[PDB]
């Protein structure tokens, strides 16, 4: 962000999102699956349904 106009010729980066991002939950009463909140969970069906690609990118 600037106080004047940022000439698009000047800056070619889309964002600053190429850095480290720390996420920490702020409510220990809600649960997500694959990135969406669920009201109830069935633990037996979680067994054998995750891949490392889908695990490292979890909330």
């Amino acid at each position: 962000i600037d106080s004047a106009a940022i000439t698009p010729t000047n800056m070619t980066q889309p964002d600053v999102w190429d850095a480290l991002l720390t996420m920490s939950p702020l409510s220990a009463g809600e649960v997500t699956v694959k990135g969406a909140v669920v009201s109830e969970v069935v633990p037996a069906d979680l067994i054998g349904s995750y891949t490392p690609e889908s695990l490292n990118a979890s909330l």
Binding site: A5, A19, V31, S39, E40, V42
Partner: protein, 118 residues
Amino acid sequence: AEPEIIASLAPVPAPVFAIPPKPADYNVRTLRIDEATWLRMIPKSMNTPFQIQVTDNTGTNWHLNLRGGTRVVNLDQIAPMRFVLDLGGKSYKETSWDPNGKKVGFIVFQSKIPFELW
């Protein structure tokens, strides 16, 4: 650790299942859109960036540039969360851009139109 909760065949409420969690660390550019279900990206074919102005809570305007590839995090459908951005060890240096003295910040957009149609 109650074994009936962890081996139930029937739905269990979220509060009865939850435990105090631990933080996680990510890097958005290295992340993929297909695997991460909480990311959105403007399609790269745009190639016509536009500059917009936004005010803060006090009343001081700012200028911004959006273009093809700009990534956002889809806030809805997630519990309350805490984000920390750490930009150490990066340059962001261009032919006509010097990172010294530049300001980097979060913005929150609230709109009906889906992000990619922007």
